Amino acid sequence: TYTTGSFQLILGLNAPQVISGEGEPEGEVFASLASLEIKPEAHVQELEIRLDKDTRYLTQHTRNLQPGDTFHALVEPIGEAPLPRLRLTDSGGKPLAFGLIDQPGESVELNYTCDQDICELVVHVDGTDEAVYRLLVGINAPNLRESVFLESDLVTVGLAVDQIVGVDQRSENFSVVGTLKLSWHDPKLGFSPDQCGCTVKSFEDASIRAVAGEINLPLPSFSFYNQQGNRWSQNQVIFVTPDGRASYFERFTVTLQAPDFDFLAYPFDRQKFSIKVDLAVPTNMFIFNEIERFQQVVGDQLGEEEWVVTSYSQEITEVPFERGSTNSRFTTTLLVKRNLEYYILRIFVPLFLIISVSWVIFFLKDYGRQLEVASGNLLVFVAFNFTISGDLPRLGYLTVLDRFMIVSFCLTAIVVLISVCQKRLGAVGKQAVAAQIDTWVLVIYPLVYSLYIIWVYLRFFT
């Protein structure tokens, strides 16, 4: 490949000390730059820009200009959009030129010439008196009638999840173990091998912020948006190639807040585990551009897990940033569900059998036995309820399971009340009414249970 960088050139005429590399300037000059003999090379760039309702002001930064250079810019709307104002300022905000509306009043143009040793310019386009405009800019190109701007550095990102290690249903947070990777290109980080005799330079056990502060160069630092407390990190390394290609690697264990949890439909609920990585720099410096899948996003492990992942996705977006501008965001989302067989077999079948015991006793015609069995079955129900109390999260609000337990307990107690009434009726000599009540209860109870189940399904799952 070729190479890039700055250089120092020493030329001598009949001065044998030059080949030592230490020749100090002397005598009268004899050579000059060749490019000065011809017209300077022009650079031209065109951009399409749009001023949304909340984004009526736009600014762009230019590359450095050498003394004697010239700058030209013009703006022409795509359609019937009104002509915006155009102006040019340096990096401090000092005005240098203002746009002039042409006599065929469809465009605005600007011109400037460089006096200082180094000039850094900013182009302002504003319509704050879906409009879309065409912006044309050139250096040493007066023929604009018939890259100049700086470009953001592109970052590649990737993330993999190894294990979900905990979920807190009262404080609404979860913890995850995984791996993160970043990669970008920066010519300012390049070095010359002959000064170190090596091809790879590395930094270990340091955050990107610390390395950036040590080498005094801007780097794409990041943070987890919903991080709770400190983060544990292993195998943290940064290494750079002579061309300037850099990469970051980290293995992390972190706890993330998740206020989006909703446990109303427990245990039939479905949840989302979202992991957000945000750059700590403005979008005009660094931006996420590509997604790399270095491993499986969701890793398989031996044995069963409490949460089963159904699907996942990865996406890049932009979010508002402090001190204006914008910062990039990388999001990983996992869709998870619980193990249904566990809850069904552990809770619902025994509950059904307990309910059946209280239902079947109405076939008896000896009401004392019916009363005694109902009284015993209520105690059995309460004992089973606290036995399963361990799988009953205390959240401060009702779930589906709590409502079902309450309804079942109420019906079980009403059975005892009806049994007492039937016993009294049989004692007074009205056995026919007791038999009619038995038939009514035997018909009605399963209908009530089925109707309650239908109502719950309608009100919670559709």
Out of Ca ion, its own copies, none, what residue 171 binds, judged by CB under 5 to 8 A for its kind, is its own copies
Q: From the list Ca ion, its own copies, none, which binds 227 (C-beta under 5 to 8 Å, kind-based)?
A: its own copies
**Buried b vs exposed e over 197-217: b needs ≥16 C-beta within 10 Å?**
eeeeeebeeebbeebbeeeee
Q: Is 318 annotated as a binding residue?
A: no
- Pairing of β 307-320 and β 270-279: unpaired
Q: How far is the CB of 395 from Ca ion (least distance, A)?
A: 10
Q: Residue 164 or 371: which CB sits closer to Ca ion?
A: 164
**Cβ 347 to Ca ion shortest distance, Å:** 24
Q: Which 322-361 residues touch its own copies, going by CB under 8 A? A: 322-323, 338-339, 341-342, 345-346, 349-350, 353-354, 356-357, 360-361
User: What sections of 55-158 are H helices per DSSP?
Assistant: none
Residue that is written with structure tokens 């109420």 in the block: 410
Question: Whole-angstrom Cα distance, residue 101 to residue 232?
Answer: 60
The residues in 356-375 that bind its own copies, with binding defined as CB under 8 A, are 356-357, 360-361, 363-366, 368-369, 371-373, 375
Residue 172 labeled ligand binder: yes
Strands 95-98 and 286-291, by their bridges, are unpaired
**Of these partners, Ca ion, its own copies, none, which one is at the site of residue 199 (CB under 5 to 8 Å by kind)?**
its own copies
Tell me if 261 contacts Ca ion by CB under 5 A.
yes
Residues 42 and 323: their CA atoms lie apart, in Å, by 36
Binding flag, residue 423, its own copies (CB under 8 A): yes
Distance CA 345, CA 68 (A): 85
Residues between 301 and 360 with contacts to Ca ion, criterion CB under 5 A? 301, 303
Q: Which residue is nearest to Ca ion (CB)?
A: 303
Give least dist CB 402 to its own copies, A.
7
| Least distance (Å) between residue 302 CB and its own copies | 5
Q: How far is the CA of 92 from the CAs of 23, 50, 95, 227, 419, in angstroms?
A: 40, 25, 9, 37, 91
* Partner from Ca ion, its own copies, none binding residue 382, C-beta < 5-8 Å depending on class: its own copies
Question: Percent helix, strand and coil across the chain, each rounded to 5?
Answer: 30, 35, 35
Which residues make up the interface to Ca ion (CB under 5 A)?
Answer: 259, 261, 301, 303
